[PDB]
């Protein structure tokens, strides 16, 4: 009964220019096990209209999805991605910086 | 395309 | 070595209805099919263009072979339960993964048949593909199981043979996208920390397959300790993306060298800021 931590990676499908639709990625990946709770947030907010990947997993058996949504970034505009699994000691938000 | 039987354990 | 993959995974929801079986099929990086059993209609469906053109018959037959192995690992995670002592209570993870590494010959390069319960190996099909390795006690009840029933036979047969030709002709209806790496748009960027250093980040984009080498260099001398490196991620358009970041001293950036290796370049590239 093994327990493996998700990692976290919030980006953009294309590099970020203001007013250009693009869409904001949520990468979780190497947890297990499977259920996590992710969400897309813009201002503190959640992000109604988010798909996300099929379940699958790696040759290590951890599990990874990818979390998205069409957006177009402004600079007011603050997005981060807040993610909850039980190895985590309490729910991880990673802000989405351009630059990363 | 896959396995075309079931696996039980 | 190009490849064909499915990963099957069973999870139990005690009191929450009955277990979710979610199936993947892959060639290299490629999705090709899912199948979530918590669909409206769960059915096959293709996830790639080289796949729908296969007929109805096709579909249905596969649609079929998942249906019935959801059935089957319901079973599965109750006898594993009954196996490990666990209570109604808990929730339990079965997860399957098999498929062919495809040879320069047109056969068989390598085969694949392996399990794992709660994340932990649990069965798996031996490179020779006629025994197994029973991860413990319990996977070892399994394996009496299926050295009477002779389990291997048929997958021997199916790894050797089918898997092979699907993959082949997988290959043949996706040659241009399958068979065609894109090598990866490369560009580095420049993010002062402090009035003294400087964070350069090295970036390879909308690559395909993911396998990739980035590694920055300080005089010739790889960075490998001071490089945050981050894990290969999808674009979410079949693509991926990488970056490598290294924090230098102001007015030393010409002293760093950014390396790609990647199978759609020619050449390894060497990119300076």
Known sequence: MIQRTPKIQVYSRHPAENGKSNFLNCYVSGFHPSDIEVDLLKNGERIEKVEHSDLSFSKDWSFYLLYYTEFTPTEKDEYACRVNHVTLSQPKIVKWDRDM | ?9 | ?273
């Open chain 3, 1 to 273: 070595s190009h490849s064909m993959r499915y990963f099957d995974t069973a999870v139990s929801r005690p009191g929450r209805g009955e277990p979710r079986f979610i199936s993947v099929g892959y060639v290299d990086d490629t999705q090709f099919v899912r199948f979530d059993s918590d669909a409206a209609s769960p059915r096959g469906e293709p996830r790639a263009p080289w796949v729908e053109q296969e007929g109805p018959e096709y579909w249905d037959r596969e649609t079929q072979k998942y249906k019935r192995q959801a059935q089957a690992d319901r079973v599965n995670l109750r006898k594993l339960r009954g196996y490990y002592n666990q209570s109604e209570d808990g929730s339990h993870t079965l997860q399957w993964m098999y498929g062919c590494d495809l040879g320069p010959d047109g056969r068989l390069l390598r085969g694949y048949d392996q399990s794992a319960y709660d994340g932990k190996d649990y069965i798996a099909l031996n490179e020779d593909l006629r025994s197994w390795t029973a991860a413990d006690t319990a996977a070892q009840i399994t394996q009496r199981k299926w050295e009477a029933a002779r389990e291997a036979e048929q997958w021997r047969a199916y790894l050797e043979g089918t898997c092979v030709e699907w993959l082949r002709r997988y290959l043949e209806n996706g040659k241009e996208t399958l068979q065609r790496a894109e090598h990866p748009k490369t560009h580095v960027t420049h993010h002062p920390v402090s009035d003294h250093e400087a964070t350069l980040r090295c970036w390879a984009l909308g690559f395909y397959p993911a396998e990739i080498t980035l590694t920055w260099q300080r005089d010739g001398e790889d960075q490998t300790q001071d490089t945050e490196l981050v894990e290969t991620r999808p674009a979410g358009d079949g693509t991926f993306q990488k970056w490598a970041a290294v924090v230098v001293p102001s007015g030393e950036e010409q002293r760093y060298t950014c390396h790609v290796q990647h199978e759609g370049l020619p050449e390894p590239l060497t990119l300076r800021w």
């Open chain 2, 1 to 9: 395309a896959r396995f075309n039987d079931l696996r039980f354990v």
